[PDB]
Specification:
The complex is a heterodimer of chains A (about 5) and B (about 1000).
Chain A (H helix, E strand, L loop, with lengths): L7
Chain B lengths: L2 H10 L3 H18 L3 H14 L3 H20 L6 H9 L4 H16 L9 H11 L6 H20 L5 H23 L3 H16 L2 H4 L2 H14 L5 H17 L1 H6 L3 H12 L5 H6 L6 H15 L6 H6 L1 H6 L3 H17 L1 H6 L1 H12 L4 H17 L1 H5 L2 H13 L4 H17 L2 H21 L3 H18 L4 H11 L14 H20 L2 H4 L3 H13 L3 H18 L7 H13 L7 H20 L5 H17 L4 H18 L19 H16 L7 H18 L11 H14 L13 H21 L4 H14 L5 H18 L6 H14 L3 H17 L5 H21 L2 H24 L6 H10 L10 H13 L3 H4 L2 H24 L12 H16 L9 H7 L1
Chain lengths: ~5, ~1000
Amino acid sequence: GGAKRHR
Amino acid sequence: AALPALIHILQNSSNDGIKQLAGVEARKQVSKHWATQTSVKQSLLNSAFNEGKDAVRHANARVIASIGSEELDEKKWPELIPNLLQAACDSNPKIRETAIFIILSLLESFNANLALHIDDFLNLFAQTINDSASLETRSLSAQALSYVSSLIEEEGEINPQYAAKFASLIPSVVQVLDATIREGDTTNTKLIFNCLNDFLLLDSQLTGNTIADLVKLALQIAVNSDVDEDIRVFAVQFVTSALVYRKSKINQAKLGPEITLAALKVASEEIDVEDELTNEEENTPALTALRLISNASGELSPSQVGVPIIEHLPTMLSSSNPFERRSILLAISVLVTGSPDYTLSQFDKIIPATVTGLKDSEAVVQLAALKCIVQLSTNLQDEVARYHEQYLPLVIDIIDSAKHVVIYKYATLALDGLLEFIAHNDIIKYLDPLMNKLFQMLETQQSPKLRAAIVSAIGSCAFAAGSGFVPYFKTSVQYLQQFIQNVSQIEGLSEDDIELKALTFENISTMGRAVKSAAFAEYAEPLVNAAYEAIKTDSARLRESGYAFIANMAKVYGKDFAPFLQTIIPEIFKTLEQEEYTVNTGIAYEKEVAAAALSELAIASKEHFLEYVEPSLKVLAEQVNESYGLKETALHSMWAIVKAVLLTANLKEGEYPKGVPSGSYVDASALAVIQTVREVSLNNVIEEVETSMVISVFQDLSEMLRLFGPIIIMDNGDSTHLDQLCREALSVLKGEHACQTILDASETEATLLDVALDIYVALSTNLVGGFAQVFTTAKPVILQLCQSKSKNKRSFAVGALSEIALGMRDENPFIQELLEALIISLTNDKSLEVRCNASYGVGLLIEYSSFDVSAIYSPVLKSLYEILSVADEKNDEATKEIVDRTFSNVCGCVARMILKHQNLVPLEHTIPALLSHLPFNTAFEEYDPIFKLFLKLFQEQNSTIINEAPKVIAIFATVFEKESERIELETNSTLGRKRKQFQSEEIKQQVIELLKHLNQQFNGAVAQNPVLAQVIA
């Protein structure tokens, strides 16, 4: 979400 | 039946251990094995009142209790409760203490006949709780009262006379608490705190108005350092629980600032600095205090929690007491999560503060600064990064001279979160020295904990740098493959060993997003196979990292990734159907990412996913009904599948037919998928008490309506789901939704308001003039909200009004009423931010008005000019964004006004002030009416503009330079990471055509600009 991580 | 065998051993065994554990097993067996019942009964009573050690005494008592619940179901043993009552008032303190104990055990059985005895217990306990002989007797009485409270409430109508009695016993229970602490009885001090915690849950008729006063008391215990620490942790937990379950009572007393400052003082206490710096509990008061501030910031308005903390920021940050400097920093870092908007607005104070922490002499302060920055980056991602020019040199130095393993970790961890959100064009200046440092570090450090942090930082470089990472891509993967060997072999690997492997998978896949498939083609075959090996492994963390790799691969390869569906969807479905159980967090994380990978695959493999739709919705639907922590994510993923399906029907984002569909514009097959998810969405907001689930649901619904139009919520002229939706949304605005009904609000509650307002903004754009009938019930409420005590509520509402006006355009049959309201705001509101948002609406409504507004041009323009002039004064990035948005919104409004009724506006003083605030620094959508005005003014050869041509070209120089900077970023940035200068291609060409004429005229000064000369030709 506009960040690299998915958690 | 070995039941009597157990009691005989309980009574007569030579070893007390024996007699004790015999009675423990006897209790269990009573239920199953219970003619000579009375022989066993009398032996148990005798031993209970006579055994020397209370431990054996309690043993017999608990057997007696289970036995007594058995007989009361047969309505047998009528003498038990009456004898116990008699013994509780006996003259022997020891006899009373044992009688109360047995009664508590009876109440613990929850036998229904105890409901017949409410008055006896109330009368009895009202006495025994003050028993001067025995503190144990008083504590057991306090404990018994918790059960008596529940008993009185099971009744349909709680009996007032009882509740009055119970309400008077509360001050006595406080008295026992004082006793337990004076006597140093920690065991019973805990027990009594549990009784106080249980009072939070009771109805208000039973408790009186004591809740605030209880909190005030718990704070006074918690701040007093003479008290044992374990007792103080109890006190801080009790306040924390009060914020959760009884925040309404805390607000009435304005106890927020008390709570905050109390916990701030507790958190300033000496700690184990050596353990802090190297260790890798929350039963030391200073730490429980931070959990308090955390909960406080999430439950109360920032005026209650954050304003006090920030008021105390200057003095504690300069104190000579390192633990106060450490404290204020950690206090902030737990504040940002619940109050991120409030925190961001204090960046003028906070950023210099973290910079002070990084420069401290004491490493404990330095670690607090770092934790603070990490917390800032996690929640306000880009904003923290902007200050990289000062952070990066200070953080790098800390890595170089670090003397403790945890400082190094958080320095590396802070560097990561900065680079992660640093802007593409800024990281390039740094990319080479950081890459050499990051790899230099990765070599030197050998603990996997540190290497994992370096690996994440290195991947964050890739994320920021996008294309700019290709020179390092192969070099990096070469080094990193060493951490991704023997993936299936997990045995004999530590928790961190798996983490160093899991992160390497995740950040190698973030490199592929940065350098796209062409540069990734070399390693796709080995990596994809490794990732699939991880999915089949037995570590949830490792399977989870495989799913991360898949989801990122989906971004990189698109439809090329469809061949793998057959193998991957089976593993994804398996992961999601796992049992989640205490709860297994590793599985929860693994399920979140697998659901993400599922969504990413469906969006990527467009046509190929169709056979998987029914199964994926079936599996995801199941998790919504039955999952513990995946309901929100699982529902979001169901909508991503719909998005995939609609995208496959070549329904293009934004291209839906406006208005209410009398039938459907989606093929019957796709409409079935919409309706399935739509019912699940509606069912999880109706009578939903978790505000997380409502925000999440309202967000998904708002996005999907914006992308694909009203068919998301209604079809075939049947507005049943649309009406249910507005009921709930309007309910949230009234403050009366299930999740609200458990005047400054928490940012969470503010957010709930905004997403509901956004349900309307989205519908208005989707229905246009067909929106009016829905809007009618909400219009008074929203208008009402524009006049709220809260500046944040006002701003949200005025903004939503403006955006509704834009969706309805000239079919707005309420333009006049809306215009009158927003002009009142534009004129009379004390918040610049509110006046700025109002200016946007005012211009839109004027632009859509078909009636006569000549009357309001002079006052509105005088208010506009004043807003500009106060913003000119204020010209602290938080103020700068409001100042700059005011420039764009105000200039947009004037422009819309001049274009509407050019002749009611005096252009002589207006055009200069407008030019003076161009070019914009934000809100470039307000360029659109300004471009149209520049086009109109030149075609009329209007003198005021024609003498001002030089600034116009300078503005278009900047406009066009930014549009080409932006086009470059579009191709260089990492895949998946409003900067538009032009709102349409047509307006771009019209601006271009004008730039040519400007060249034909005026001696070609337009082409004298490198930037526009390139666009003119």
